[PDB]
Amino acid sequence: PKARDQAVFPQNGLVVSSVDVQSVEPVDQRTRDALQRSVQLAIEITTNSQEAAAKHEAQRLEQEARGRLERQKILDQSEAEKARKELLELEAMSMAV
Amino acid sequence: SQEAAAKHEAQRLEQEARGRLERQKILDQSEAEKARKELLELEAMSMAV
Amino acid sequence: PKARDQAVFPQNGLVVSSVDVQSVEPVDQRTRDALQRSVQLAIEITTN
């Protein structure tokens, strides 16, 4: 015998019931306002997604972790310079020959 | 969560613990430099030959 | 027996129901305004 906000159901050997409470003038409007605002943020992130960023920034954050190392990437260069150095002395070694 | 962050920040906190070591990551580099040094003296050793 | 914002459907052995709430003077206009604004940003990114 459900009746508006009165959900009852006395089963053959079990009793089911449920009743809830909602809305209050000041908070009702504030609740609705909240709901409509979340849509805004959604559109906002959607716009940024339409532009580009996304994967690019993902890679940024990932690499910044490596950045905290001590500019990780510069290390990659130091060894590269080493390789360049190898060639320099080689140009001299071949010139020595 | 929709933007990104998440895993990225998780890794941050985890690594910061290692950071408190004394910039853990720099140590990883010092040894790497050692390896680079090994090559330098090798370029000199091979040049010595 | 649907009746405006009163969707009910007592199946042979199941009860279906649904009712919703929408619009409030200040926020209704603000909602509509939001909807029309998203189109602007769309045109903006389109121009670029």
Curated annotation (Swiss-Prot), chain B:
Cross-link type Glycyl lysine isopeptide (Lys-Gly) (interchain with G-Cter in SUMO2), residue numbers: K37
Coiled coil stretches, renumbered: none
Cellular compartment(s): Cytoplasm; Nucleus
Domain of life: Eukaryota
Post-translational modification note: Phosphorylated on Tyr residues after EGF stimulation.
Summary of subunit composition and partner proteins: The vault ribonucleoprotein particle is a huge (400 A x 670 A) cage structure of 12.9 MDa. It consists of a dimer of half-vaults, with each half-vault comprising 39 identical major vault protein (MVP) chains, PARP4 and one or more vault RNAs (vRNAs). Interacts with TEP1. Interacts with PTEN and activated MAPK1. The phosphorylated protein interacts with the SH2 domains of PTPN11 and SRC. Interacts with APEX1. May interact with ZNF540.
Primary role: Required for normal vault structure. Vaults are multi-subunit structures that may act as scaffolds for proteins involved in signal transduction. Vaults may also play a role in nucleo-cytoplasmic transport. Down-regulates IFNG-mediated STAT1 signaling and subsequent activation of JAK. Down-regulates SRC activity and signaling through MAP kinases.
Domain remark in the UniProt entry: MVP 3 mediates interaction with PTEN. MVP 4 mediates interaction with PARP4.
Name of protein: Major vault protein
Organism: Rattus norvegicus (Rat)
